[PDB]
Symmetry: C5
Subunit: 310 residues, 5 copies
């Protein structure tokens, strides 16, 4: 029973994030518990203050006509319970629910551990024979308690795109809004657990430049390369099959090389010290002691600059 | 209360993929959130435009007769909420839901990491005493936003088989449609993480052709073979117990050999250099330095050509 | 409101497997989506063809009395939606649902990778004051599309035990039917991934019969025994804590021995070649080169014959 | 509308385990599908046999007053469908459902692989203004088909504590019953897969007493210690963070020592055979050859006796 | 239909924890099954004891006006079934449900294995045109059976913050309460499984101070460093990406160093014993034998004191 209008009836939205949780890097989703505030003029139940009752009349959903506000990027029918409905005298309705659905927003892992993110929540609404334009009321949209959680994420700002996008979707126009949740990752536990440990094994790898033994120079360069896959695999896991290249996937792969040419040098400091030419053997080996850490620290400024500095 | 017809009543379908997610290679399933558009002539509620009401009359499901459209390959009762029902004057009904069920479509892992896929969605409908033929309305079937996701898959096209298949199923005919979702895998993160790393270990394996020491030539060919199972097992995992052979399962298994005859050669460059015949030892070893990488690169052209080039 | 009979009313069943999926070796269960066809004479709503309506009258469940057909071995209340109900004039009712529950049938892993299986679906039905005997109508039981899936299983036949079993269960008799799904495993991906790889490591183990060095004869027999646990554990995982012995659990355990006596021989070819008696050392070692592969190939004909050939 | 009594109305319970499955050692829970039989005198619907109808009158739940029987230790609202309700003439009611909820019973892993267990199911019932005492009818409680499953567990007996416990819970007394399911584990697959394999690696560890080489005596004692953590971790996984000590957690930890002092001995048979005193070296080493296996077999009788024999 | 008051109507709450389970360190959530007791004066259904019926009248939810009590930090619409409603004569209502939702309370992993926790449950309630203040009745809040579980946690006390917090949330004030569950972790299974094993490998690492061989001094310091990542990774797993530093993450990382300088020393006891200056080699090596275990035991007093002792 939609509200007999004279033009496209505006509906006024608003979201108060109560809870934020379980951002799932692999699935690229997150759950959110929050308020959903709607409002519109339904002159059809304007109601004479003095003549009867009181300031505002409480209705049940079945009584009033209510605009079907569906979320766009959600796995399931959103999970809301209605909190209150209050009809002003002019025929203005005040709606409030408290939904909790899991949202499907994509993430950009280009700078993986040192990445910032922009999540999205949507709210389309399809028309009937009066058009429906949605729009935000920023007193109900300042939504985000001083308690929002999001484990392992710093939260930067909950804002929203005032101007909606009105679509042509199947002989009926809908109107879609963009609620933006901006976050930065708490990279850190990434260092004592992944970055640093990954680095130390790399250095011991090439302790084998200050050694003559092949027997102990494979037990060296090789034993570490194993340990590196332990880190490659640990990381390749809490992260999706990105069609692009990650920052960490970069240096985690750049590393694979300094083990290959490390295992190259130790191999050649042998078919060139068994060929009785240690003239050249402890010449190469001596150089590698600089070649490597420098090409590295250089390739990391080269790699690093390539990702953040552009 | 089915619509008194004069022939097999056509029902007009259509699916608008809103979301696609969680393609599960192991289970061979995927979840999809999408619209379901139906329509048919139910002359029984044709309704005199001028005489009453308006252009089109909105009903509730309980009011109208509605065709039971069940999905064929689905784990559970599909999870749909009804979006709108609009009855045209001629007795034509316009239905729209927004379901989200997980689909059971099989996948072909013959070219695993470099494989393209064809997923299926079904929609049977059983008859009563008027027959039901289903069919597609391609304005409601262009379904697939410019936002469909499918992590780690490039999506090629959402089309559908115009001509249905009408079955004889238990003294009542049903009519079944084929909605096709075509995708190609984003192989790539397969290289820096599986292909390349798997290769590197294979090369170091056979650095042991340029060495005399057995002590460091097992610490060599053996230490890597371990690391290979790390990749055999990493892969054997995100992939089902196929009754056929995978491309990667092939070369991952072809590899097992070049470690066996690699461990053969180093073993024989010993009971043939302890038998004081290093005449032959550093003859064999010298050859293997070519035999191997060539038999390989040859066996990979032989293997590769065998899978894609036919 | 049960159908006033003169004897135990027969109810006629039938199952049309639409989908089969997710057979879970560890949990010993499987999910199935299928039709459930029932029928019985309820003379109480026989209904005068000519006098009124039409050939057959469509009812809703609430209208008719319906026999509660519960599945026996199922995790949960089975998940069915009703497809159609049609009452013949003689008072004969025609019922069809389309359930999908996960079944708890046990499996026999005695021949694990080369095992064939027999799954079960049950359907009891408890009596009131007329007795209920169930029985099958084989036109509705030929159920199993030419599309049944069951990843990694070849499917042999869907049949069912015509004669039911009528129990005495709590002062009321029930009647239970046996629907049989026969399957064979697609062993194969078991070879290039488990059998073969497990074998190769075993052979390299005992490359250490053609070697003098203990240093490289432990880096040999020992380095492989590790890799074997990688396969013992990979297999011990996708398989339940069976109270009996598996075929693969057998040879996977028979193997553990040929590494123990292999590590025995290499150990004794040392406290018997450091005791300056290489007379005996390269005597034993020379024998083991045959002893082993033969005792093995013999113990596998002995083991193999013991499991399949009896 | 509760049955106007003259004293605390007794309700007569009973559980017929139809299915048992998925005992989850880590979570300490299990799922059960079973009957639930209740009965009580509600003289308020006693009903004159001859005067009307028949022997017993079938009602729907909404008709009769029914005692709310909630399970105590359950994750969720239990999942029951009602099977039949039959009211005797004296006003005696006969109820039967067929629930299936997952039960939260704790387990005692003190003897882990060789442990027996006692599971629990509960059924409280809160009072109104007539008191409710629950109690069991052992014809409906002999519940447990000759088909109960419980993968990897032998099932010993389904009994129940006749005498209930009546609580004072919030100004209303409740009455709680104890249904006991006793089981023993099928330890076995624990041997060829965990115990035995764990033992063999331990023996090879200390093959290094019959060797002089340190190079091959670390490749020995160390290479196995790795393989042991593979078993420590395999086991530490299918088992909860117990605040006590397991039998297997014991010997799996007692083992860690015989590797430490094994790695001690081989280390000292070196800074005491480089120090030109092989007088003492191949003295110690010679002893360890007995010291170890004996201290062990002794420590296992000491450990074993400590756990089962007390 | 809210109770016509003269001031802000107080509602009296209370929670009786029946079950506690599945505290999920990674997700920072826990499930709880419990009673929810509410009460308030609704003089509007005060009801003349003598004049009619009895002491207290039982209603159904639809009958009475009931305050919507929503939980704040919960994933979903809380999962409650209503247990009883009893209206006193003065118009006082007595409500009791038995909900079971999973709660989103944050945890502080600063002292990870030796950490104590404070969980939260919330209950807001939004106002209409009478204000609602919530408050606790400590006879119904002594809630926590003598059976509360919480695997791997010792439970210290269930209390609650008497004084509520009344918000200004969207032109309507709400009232929120704080129910506190205090717990301590059962660290312990952390020792025989993580702390101790992690330590032992560290000690063997530096058995290489009493050795001359580089070949066996890498097979030493290196083979252990691998095993350490096995523990770094085992722990980094059952623990969230904390933006701060854990105690165990500390010493697990402090450890990475004593392997680096350990692998430093063994490397330098070589380019300084091949440079014929074993004067200095077995001088350094001799010192490290003390330097290390002391700097460590000192750095652990330094680290330890830094975390708990402040
Ligand atoms: Cs080695």
């Amino acid at each position: 029973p939609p509200p007999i209008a004279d033009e496209p009836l505006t509906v006024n939205t608003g979201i108060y994030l109560i809870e934020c949780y379980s951002l799932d890097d692999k699935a690229e989703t997150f759950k959110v518990n929050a308020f959903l505030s709607l409002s519109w003029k339904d002159r059809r139940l304007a109601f004479d203050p003095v003549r009867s009752g009181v300031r505002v009349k409480t209705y049940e959903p079945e009584a009033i006509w209510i605009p079907e506000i569906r979320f766009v990027n959600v796995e399931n029918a959103r999970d809301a319970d209605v909190v209150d409905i209050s009809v002003s005298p002019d025929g203005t309705v005040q709606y409030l629910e408290r939904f909790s659905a899991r949202v499907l927003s994509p993430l950009d892992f280009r700078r993986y551990p040192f990445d910032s993110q922009t999540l999205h929540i949507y709210l389309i609404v399809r028309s009937v024979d009066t058009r429906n334009i949605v729009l935000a009321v920023d007193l109900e949209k300042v939504g985000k308690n001083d308690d929002v959680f999001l484990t392992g994420w710093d939260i930067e700002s909950f804002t929203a795109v005032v101007k909606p996008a009105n679509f042509a979707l199947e002989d009926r126009l809908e109107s879609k809004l963009d609620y933006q949740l901006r976050i930065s990752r708490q990279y850190f536990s990434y260092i004592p657990n992944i970055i640093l440990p990954m680095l130390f094994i790399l250095f011991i790898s090439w302790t084998a430049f200050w050694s003559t033994s092949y027997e102990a120079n494979v037990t060296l360069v090789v034993s570490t390369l194993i340990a590196h896959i332990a880190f490659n695999i640990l990381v390749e896991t809490n992260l999706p099959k990105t069609p692009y290249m990650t920052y960490t996937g970069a240096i985690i792969f750049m590393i694979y090389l300094f083990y290959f040419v490390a295992v190259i040098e130790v191999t050649v400091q042998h078919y060139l010290k068994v060929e009785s030419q240690p003239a050249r053997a402890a010449s190469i080996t001596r150089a590698s002691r600089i070649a490597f850490p420098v090409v590295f620290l250089l390739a990391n400024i080269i790699l690093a600059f390539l990702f953040f500095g552009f």
